[PDB]
Structure formats: structure tokens, C-alpha cells
Amino acid sequence: GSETDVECFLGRAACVHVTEIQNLFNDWKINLSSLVQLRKKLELFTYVRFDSEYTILATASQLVVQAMYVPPGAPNPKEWDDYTWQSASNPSVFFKVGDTSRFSVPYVGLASAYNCNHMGSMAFRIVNEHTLVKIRVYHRAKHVEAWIPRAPRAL
């Protein structure tokens, strides 16, 4: 009966966002409501507290990738020569195209749990100057706590 635990039921890696960059940039505001197979299981609880593990996979077709996390309440990049990319406050990871990176954002919220809520945003660029890269981000909820079971949505 370990598969009925909420870390087993909700805490598994699914593909939350898929984008494509060129050699310019793409920013995704983090919202786990975009994937209807994870939202259908998560919206049967009112409040939920969980840390996170993002595993980013980059694949090319016809190089370095700068996947930068942006904390809640901080501006997103608007171009591919912006100052947000060079900014020290916002974390970033530089990994080669074809393999995968992995990081782990802590529970970032204002209330003691998310109510299905500002998780932040991830911005993606390729650093080389003067090919189409497909980015797949897989999110895994960690140390989950749920608190009011709701009726499951039918429509």
C-alpha cells in the first residue's frame, strides 16, 4: 500500500512544458494547471505544499542552453540581449544540447501552501552568437502535504 501515499500518487515526473528556441528565447510562467493529467489529480485537494525538482531535456535538429529560473515577483526576459540574463540575483544553469540538467526550487509561496500561488518563471535561450532546439521540462513534486479533499471534477 505504498502507492496510495501522496508522495507516490502526486510526486512523479511528468512533461509540464515543451518549447523551441533558434540560434531566440522563450519564457514560461510556471503553472502546473497546463497539464490536464496532473491538474486532474492535484485539483481534488484545496491546499498543497511541495518543493520541486525540474529536469530540463534539450535536443537539437537542423550548443549551450541557459535555462534561468526567475523567483516570484522578479521581471522576465523580453529579448535575447536583455540585462535579466546577465543578472546575478536570478539563478541559471548552463548545459550542453543533447543531455539534461536538474535543479530543485524550494517551496516558493506567500501563503503556507498553494491553493489550486506565484511559483515563478523559467526562461530559455541558447548562448552561442553569430539550428532549432526542443526543450522539454519535467517537474516532480517533492515533500508534498495535502489538506482538504474535494469532489473530483467531471467536466
Binding site: 484545496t46 491546499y47 503556507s112 491553493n115 482538504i148 479533499p149 469532489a151
Partner: protein, 168 residues
């Protein structure tokens, strides 16, 4: 025994009692819905404290009683939903099987005519600007209308210390 007195109020059933307007359960009515504390925004001293203080925190005890004889049929489902999604003291005159997951107490005229629900303060923050919604749904239709009375008692209520703080 059967005369719970709370503050300046007294009720007979089996911190003050606010009795909302009595609704008439006709055979074609779908039910009713009351968001809390919005149903008490115009309710005397509570409505004054709720408006005056920026933040607050309160629990509730809801007694729903349907005055009727021992000849009527049908059953109502009284359910309190925390954080319900898409009115005042007049309520909202209106899957369902799954609503039993939420705290509920079926009233069935055959056997019972009262339902009492003690609601604690449920929120993702310890204190908040003044959250839950009580619904009354007639499931089995009424066969012989019958009056429905809703009584809300806010209890264990605290409000913010600002506007009462000295700066010295």
C-alpha cells in the same frame, strides 16, 4: 438540554445566534447557497467588527432547522464547501454524488428535522481580510411547502490589533 442560550440570544434545538431569513422549500426548488462571512456582512455587531477591522479570523456553528409536522416526506443535504468557486444575508436561491466528501449532515423529514455543523477556521494563512460556503440541496423532493431556518453562531473569533495599538 434543549434551550442553548448564547449571549443575548436563546434558541430551541436538539458569540450570538444570527437567524437568516426563513426560506420556503417548495417541491420545485433546487436549493440555496450562503457564502460566509458574506451572509453576515449586514448582521448587526458582527457586520460592524467585520467592516471596521482590516483582518479577522472566525469559526462558525451552523444550525439548520426545518419547522414541520410528522406527515411530510423528502430530504435536504446541508453541506459546507471550503473555498467554493463559480449575495448578502439573502443567499443565492438556486458532481452532486461526490459532495458527501465535504462535511455534511442529511436532514430527512421521515426521521430528522435538524442539522448542526461546527466549522473551524480553514485558510492557507493564519489571519485574513474578511471564505467557506454553505449549501442546502433538496435531494428527495417534498411530498405533502415547508420553512427552512438557518442559524449561524460565529465562535472563537479574533480580529487584528492595529487601530487599537498605541505608538508611545
Amino acid at each position: 438540554v434543549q434551550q442553548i442560550t448564547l449571549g443575548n440570544s436563546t434558541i430551541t434545538t436538539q458569540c450570538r445566534f444570527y437567524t437568516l431569513d426563513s426560506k420556503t422549500w417548495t417541491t420545485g426548488s433546487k436549493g440555496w447557497c450562503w457564502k460566509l462571512p458574506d451572509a453576515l456582512k449586514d448582521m448587526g455587531v458582527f457586520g460592524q467588527n467585520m467592516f471596521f477591522h482590516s483582518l479577522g479570523r472566525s469559526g462558525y456553528t451552523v444550525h439548520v432547522q426545518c419547522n414541520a409536522t410528522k406527515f411530510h416526506s423528502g430530504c435536504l443535504l446541508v453541506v459546507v464547501i471550503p473555498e467554493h468557486q463559480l449575495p448578502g444575508e439573502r443567499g443565492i436561491d438556486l458532481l452532486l454524488g461526490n459532495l458527501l466528501i465535504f462535511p455534511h449532515q442529511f436532514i430527512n423529514l421521515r426521521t430528522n428535522n435538524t442539522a448542526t455543523i461546527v466549522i473551524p477556521y480553514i485558510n492557507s494563512v493564519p489571519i485574513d481580510s474578511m471564505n467557506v460556503s454553505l449549501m442546502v440541496i433538496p435531494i428527495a423532493p417534498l411530498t405533502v411547502s415547508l420553512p427552512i431556518t438557518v442559524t449561524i453562531a460565529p465562535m472563537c473569533t479574533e480580529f487584528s490589533g492595529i487601530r487599537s495599538k498605541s505608538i508611545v
